[PDB]
Amino acid sequence: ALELLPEFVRTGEVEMEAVHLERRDGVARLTMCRDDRLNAEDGQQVDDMETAVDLALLDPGVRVGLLRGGVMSHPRYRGKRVFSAGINLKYLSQGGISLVDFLMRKELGYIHKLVRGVLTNDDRPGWWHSPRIEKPWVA
Amino acid sequence: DGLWAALTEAAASVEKLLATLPEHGARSSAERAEIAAAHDAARALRVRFLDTHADAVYDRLTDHRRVHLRLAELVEAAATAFPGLVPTQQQLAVERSLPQAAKEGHEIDQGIFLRAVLRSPLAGPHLLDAMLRPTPRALELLPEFVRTGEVEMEAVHLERRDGVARLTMCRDDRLNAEDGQQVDDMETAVDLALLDPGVRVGLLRGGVMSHPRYRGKRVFSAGINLKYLSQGGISLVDFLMRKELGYIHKLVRGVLTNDDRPGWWHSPRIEKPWVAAVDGFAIGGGAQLLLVFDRVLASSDAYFSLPAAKEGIIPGAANLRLGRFAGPRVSRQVILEGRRIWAKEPEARLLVDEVVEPDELDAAIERSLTRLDGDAVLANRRMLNLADESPDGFRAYMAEFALMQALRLYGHDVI
Ligand SMILES: CC(C)(COP(=O)(O)OP(=O)(O)OC[C@H]1O[C@@H](n2cnc3c(N)ncnc32)[C@H](O)[C@@H]1OP(=O)(O)O)[C@@H](O)C(=O)NCCC(=O)NCCNC(=O)Cc1cc(O)cc(O)c1
Ligand SMILES: CC(C)(COP(=O)(O)OP(=O)(O)OC[C@H]1O[C@@H](n2cnc3c(N)ncnc32)[C@H](O)[C@@H]1OP(=O)(O)O)[C@@H](O)C(=O)NCCC(=O)NCCNC(=O)Cc1cc(O)cc(O)c1
């Protein structure tokens, strides 16, 4: 996230496997876009996701976050958006859902950030009262 | 009086510019304005003549309310016995060939006729009684059905089982999109269902759909086929009227049979309770029918609407019934503003009886049919309808419909 921050601030657009971030009118719009699989979660999405949140929080140009689902390609839902079909039942049997790298990283990672924000380094005026940068989010 | 010929020269002029002028689509503007003015003076006359001579005209076509004639028959008979009053077979033919966008609107005359007919306290109850009598194609396949227990027809799939005449709307292409051929398989499914002594309760549901957007899932109905509507495939008589005076009315009062079988004195009509199950959705005529069944079931993922509001036509007999189901307030939010009630929102209980998850709808449905068996239900049903909707009520409404609808057919925006 700190890697793609500067690029994001100047660009206003970051494209990532599962999530598609984009700043607009002060909104860090995230877009769950698994145009195959109904946004079925998996420990790689949990990565694009936690990065989408961070960037969204650290971009001074963002005031409000938005989480929605992109249009789906699959036949049962072609041309229609879908929010999420939970966890990928497949990788679950196959041994692809990490207890740590996914199940835990998920609840201690991005989901927690949506509540309390990104704990930043003592750098920028205000840290004494707000060591964490939080912002309102809309789903 | 001399109203007749008056009317006649009127259809005369119209017949004239019916050739002189060029195809519809290349006229101008006193070209159009002239045919248009003509028609008006003609239709205007068609009305005045009937307001004072309908019963006569009707009496001559039916040997004084002595011969029951169905809609098609009656309008045809009318055509050859009173040229100018209503289109002839062929005349319509020319019409149906063109697309609903370029027709001269000859149906409107049938609309003016059928109206005056139902407006009479003599002819109307008779044209009605006549549309309640078993449909030939139905008396044709009756014996075969009774021995078989299965009739396969283009749009509908009938089947008797455990005393249930299960009908199954199966347009495995087009979401059961209604069309004047379905309205045929439908009215036959009902008749057979009613006349089969082995049937006690009817069931109307939607078969599984083949189309990609819905492959492997059932769908109740997507209303009327918007396509054939523009193309000129929706008959004012053979479909829009036949529909509300044909099967939909039978689901309420039953099949008017012949004096044959003991009991006719107290029950000249055989009626039975019917149960409708909704899968996916009930849009249009699909929804309209739910206002006539004894029990409506729907999966929680469903919704209903008639959302022809800003451009479409009149949603059948909904304007007549939706009132008694959900008040004048909702009634208008639905039909006037085009709103739709979702199966699960509280207000869905004004239309549906039970709402369950699709993976238990089957049992909800079965356990449903067994509850309307007794002859106690036949009586209570029958009285309840006598109260909800009465003979005069339906007649008066269907009268104005006959015309109103006609005009709504050949109206720029609907086209
Ligand atoms: C959503 C559905 C009902 C859709 O039904 P349909 O309209 O019948 O579509 P389908 O044909 O079944 O699926 C469309 C399409 O998406 C794919 N799809 C749908 N759901 C999934 C999931 N969950 N994973 C992967 N792919 C999926 C499906 O495989 C199809 O592609 P194909 O298999 O090639 O045909 C169905 O897909 C389904 O039942 N999915 C099961 C949903 C499910 O149970 N998810 C389980 C959720 N359980 C958790 O999230 C657990 C969890 C998650 C966490 O994030 C954290 C945590 O602590 C715990
Ligand atoms: C139901 C829908 C919302 C479904 O959306 P989707 O999931 O987006 O499916 P679609 O891809 O649009 O359609 C699936 C499939 O069914 C076909 N379909 C769907 N609806 C129809 C209708 N109404 N007719 C014909 N074919 C239809 C559709 O053309 C598709 O096949 P393709 O065209 O080849 O793709 C859509 O099909 C739709 O909007 N239909 C419009 C429904 C409608 O407005 N019906 C109008 C109802 N108006 C009346 O019933 C008026 C009426 C009827 C009467 O019976 C009596 C009377 O007095 C008055």
From Swiss-Prot, chain B:
Record carries keyword ATP-binding: no
Classification via InterPro entries: ClpP/crotonase-like_dom_sf, DPA-CoA_Dioxygenase, Enoyl-CoA_hydra/iso
Catalysed reactions, as listed in the record: (3,5-dihydroxyphenyl)acetyl-CoA + O2 = 2-(3,5-dihydroxyphenyl)-2-oxoacetate + CoA + H(+)
Effect on the protein of changing residue 288 to N: Slight increase of the affinity and 2-fold decrease of the catalytic efficiency compared to the wild-type
Activity regulation comment: Inhibited by DPA-S-(N-acetylcysteamine).
Keyword hit for Oxidoreductase: yes
Substitution effect: residue 178 to Q: Strong decrease of affinity and the catalytic efficiency compared to the wild-type
Annotated keywords: Antibiotic biosynthesis, Oxidoreductase
UniProt-listed Enzyme Commission number(s): 1.13.11.80
One GO BP: fatty acid beta-oxidation
GO terms assigned for molecular function: identical protein binding; oxidoreductase activity, acting on single donors with incorporation of molecular oxygen, incorporation of two atoms of oxygen
Protein origin, superkingdom: Bacteria
Enzyme category, top tier: oxidoreductase
Residues annotated as binding substrate: 172, 178, 211-214, 222-227, 285, 314-316, 405
Function description: Involved in the biosynthesis of the nonproteinogenic amino acid monomer (S)-3,5-dihydroxyphenylglycine (Dpg) responsible of the production of vancomycin and teicoplanin antibiotics. Catalyzes the unusual conversion 3,5-dihydroxyphenylacetyl-CoA (DPA-CoA) to 3,5-dihydroxyphenylglyoxylate. DpgC performed a net four-electron oxidation of the benzylic carbon of DPA-CoA and the hydrolysis of the thioester bond to generate free CoA. DpgC has the ability to process a diverse range of substituted phenylacetyl-CoA substrates.
Complex formation: Homohexamer; dimer of trimers.
Recorded family membership: Belongs to the enoyl-CoA hydratase/isomerase family.
Name under which the protein is recorded: (3,5-dihydroxyphenyl)acetyl-CoA 1,2-dioxygenase
Organism: Streptomyces toyocaensis
